[PDB]
Amino acid sequence: DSPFRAWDVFMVRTPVHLSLLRAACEDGLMEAVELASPSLAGLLARVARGDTGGLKDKRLRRAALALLRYDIRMRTRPTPFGLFAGVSGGRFDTSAKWLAGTGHRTRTRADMEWLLSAVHRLERDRVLLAGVTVQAHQTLTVRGDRIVLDCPSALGKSTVSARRSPVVAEILGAARRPVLAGRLAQSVAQRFELPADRVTGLLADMAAQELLITALRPPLDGDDPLQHVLDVVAAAEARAGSPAEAMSSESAALVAALREVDARCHAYDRTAVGQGRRELAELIQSTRRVHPHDTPLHVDLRIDLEVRLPEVVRTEIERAAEALWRLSPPRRGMRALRRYHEAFLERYGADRAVPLLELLDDTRGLGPPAGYKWPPSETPAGPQEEPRRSAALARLVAKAARRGEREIVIDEETIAELAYDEAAPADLPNSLELGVHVVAPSLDELSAGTFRVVLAPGPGSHHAGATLGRFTGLLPDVDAESAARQAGRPLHIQDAVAADVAFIPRSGRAANLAHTPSYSGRRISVGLPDSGRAQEIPLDELGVGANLERLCLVHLPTGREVVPALPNMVSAFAQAPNPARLLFELGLEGQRLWEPWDWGALSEMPFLPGVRYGRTLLAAPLWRMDQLRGPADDSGPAADWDAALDRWRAEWNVPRRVLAVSMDQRLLLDLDDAWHRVLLRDELRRTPELIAQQVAGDEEGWLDFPGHLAEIVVPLERRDRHAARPPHIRATVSPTGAGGPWLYLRLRVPRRNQDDFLRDQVPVLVRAGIEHGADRWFFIRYSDTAGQHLRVRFRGEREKLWAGLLPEIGARLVEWQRQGLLAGHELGQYDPEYERYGGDALAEFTETAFQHDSAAAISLLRLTRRAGFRYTLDEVTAISAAALADAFGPPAPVVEPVPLVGGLQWAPDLFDGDPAAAWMSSTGGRRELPPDYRRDPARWQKLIDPTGGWPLLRADEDGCQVLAALESRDEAVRRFGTAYREAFRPTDSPSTQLRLVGSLLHMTCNRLIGGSAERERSVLGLARGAVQDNLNRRRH
Amino acid sequence: RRYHEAFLERYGADRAVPLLELLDDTRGLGPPAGYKWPPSETPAGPQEEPRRSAALARLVAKAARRGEREIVIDEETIAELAYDEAAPADLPNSLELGVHV
Amino acid sequence: QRLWEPWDWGALSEMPFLPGVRYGRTLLAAPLWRMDQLRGPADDSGPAADW
């Protein structure tokens, strides 16, 4: 019954004074500390052998607290770290089970930062280099005569700018897909008639600047990185002649030194927990031979533990996930691409695809969206989001306070109150991952339904399998179910191609967490070589299109959408090159995304109750620790602190045991314990925004089998798997200046002043343009980043325009500034958008319409100044709209009535003989008629009557002057409409003509009124209603 | 406040502008954001968040636990709610309070 | 001139009850009850005792 169904399998995360130092020396914990902090391990080594150089009475107390953090961690922190905690398989079943064992196993791998230092040394070997394959970095961008790489990887070591010579360009083009470096270097030598080695040194410089990527570098596809380097050099050795000349001398020295580290890794992985302290020190100095690094190892721990949970729990979690979804923001996609999507719509419209990469380019495109770090975006972030405010949430807290309860219970009536709206099933995401604690008094009472599910602290994921990803190999059990489900993952766009994005992370910490396999059909490598394990879907084949609701990724060669996923938990925001991050966020477009429980403004309260839905704690109970900040750090007695604690503890009813939570720490503390009480003080001085959570199960007494010390990660997929959305495929492709076919002026006449400027000053400009031979002119009202202004355009011969017209114009423009008529002027580039107007063959008809409509508007505004002129601007504009609609003439024939935005079934045959009503109908929904029309339709029908020959208007002297001022522009539109029907084909999209005339209606409003979207809708409404009613009134 | 910044940026600190020319859309800065008569075309700056205070919140919570309809604040509360130490040079000339006694 | 303002509750204005604030004999802010809950029973066409 939930819209989400959980997977059968799931992953489990779980942990395994000078006296306190001496005490824990008998704990092999000593192996864990040798791994996490060799420095602390050193100190423990010279207390076990006997206290040497006096130490430091500050350092004794400093080192003990560090050790205490590691002890507590090893026994309470589920977060898979080194030898402190690790992972295991688990399953939903009909019978609960919890078999804790002791046979824990380690997997040990080379740290990526460490391994890359060596790969670099192998990359300088020109003879080895020809043995491997090379390819062009996927994010190179061409600027002028230079090749540019934004954000190279600094891993084993800001921007790279190389000159793009013909040799350089040939190399990059031939290495578009991965190609053998030797065969590459030989071809380039031929073509350019060069030394076949001087070229190889070029490939080497390029691979060093990261303009090329050698196969030597680990693909991050899920394999062991170290083994990947070895397999590759082995491919090179066994291709030349004898594994001696294939690569130089000391390169094979480095190679052997790496195979040794490999060998000692498996050796140490044979060892048990606490027992391999000798093998570990043996692995360390081995790696140190290759290169001395602070942290050259990454260790994952497989926990010996069998966990099974009954179906009643799987159902709780599924119902919880639903709750969080219904309570989520009324948004599709990440918030980070909402303004970008609008920007995209504004610049490109909804029928154009832009090669991803050109879109991301500062110069050629939109650039990266606000906030993107790599390279940093220059686009400003929009308004910040206010922490939420809810009368509903506040009540929950207030009541819980009166009655002194630490948890409040919400039901369907509570959820119906918090929902920003009714969440539509079409918006359900493809997948997600919740990490939870499951707690109960006993395995058996659990089986019977006496348990709690507590949503764990930390971020969730938006991909089923992401969290399990980097633990691949360790749980053969779940890896095979995982790979099978992801192989058939649900998609939300019909016919979409699924793919996985793989990228090199910016930091070496995250780089160690990116060894994660791809199970979609495809992989998009960004800043990494292709992988042998996955068919590459090349970045440069990708485009971005848009509709009113979402952006969308398109594989340009085939016209199918792509739905990329990021199958690990590396943070795209913090760690990913921009294109990679864009791929990630685009994949989540069109999906409404769940978020943790949001307390909003209420987060300031000193205590927040846990929130329960059925058996699930959506949010744990919560204690701020502000009051304790001052009593912490006061250089005073241990009881001077303890008192403030007890005072705080009793004032808000804080339990004896708390979880101390920040971004970096979960910290299980017993506040009865004297050591834990000082640890909390140090931690608070250190992390000021720290909070306290009630431990899972404590509130129900259950803290006396270990569900609160274990995290369960359970993936869930949309139950109804079918893709709700059709693709949006209209994939497409695509410069003049101060030279001059066009003179394009920006006149900074503020809006209030514009009508007068148009009546009096623009005529002067038009007269000047004419006597200098300008053949076309027009004006529009425009608003840019600098406000509202007028833009006037002239077309003519370059010399006459720039040496004759421009200085006459400029002198007048300077006079007008002194008289205070405009603040200033600029000259800008004109990019004519004939595609909105039927294409380049129709351009002359478009320019003409624009010229004559411009002249008409000036005429009308000039009538409108006169005292006594009967008609308002809205009237003459309505008159002008209807007159244009009449003038365009009959539509092109239709195949099917067109689905219109208003629900109207737009159909040419409905409007035989009445082109005015035809076109005015495409302009709005019948209900969107303005008030002023509905309260008085008898008037507007009588006034705005083009089909009837404009009888009432021709009575009035003023009404006549209105129609005369529109003749020439009616003529122009008539011709345009004619040549337009002439060039029609029944094949053409029905949308072209509806958008064209609509554009023509919009510009008539722009020239006359507007600088107001509502005003345009009213004025168009008036005309729409009037001509529609005149048509209906005829035959009744 | 943004008007004051706009001014320094365009005119500097060694120049007076006839009031009215300053207010003119074309010749000056125009009216400041929000002015109704005539309406300014200047965009308003970032909107101000309703304040959030751990200090304000404790007072509400404490009052709630103990069911009290009043909370009593002293100098220690004021030292905590003050955004800063107000300078005597910043004292206003005058003000008017309406009260019930 | 630094300009005085009324007592500002800020985001906390959503709370169903706000206690009055007393600074030795002066009530800087009166106590305050929101009436969200009473909105639905209002306009409900029912008996005078139902309200």
Add this chain to the structure above:
Amino acid sequence: PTGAGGPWLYLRLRVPRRNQDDFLRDQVPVLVRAGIEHGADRWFFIRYSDTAGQHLRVRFRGEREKLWAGLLPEIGARLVEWQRQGLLAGHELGQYDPEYER
């Protein structure tokens, strides 16, 4: 209060900040030589931010005819070529207010 008439030619070149140093190294010199052979007597550049982002402003001073009928169209041809090569997004011609009082 001066304008498109022309003691000053004032260019706004929409080159994003990350790209500017390269543009100043390679492209601005081309513009400066063009200004010289058309008899411009002074030139300078500044980095500026207006409402449409970070850009470069390049200014030339010279005789009106040489500036607007000679230099400007040569400059312009270069400006569109460079735009095609992805070096700048666009250009405008703006008014110059020398702030000599400062």
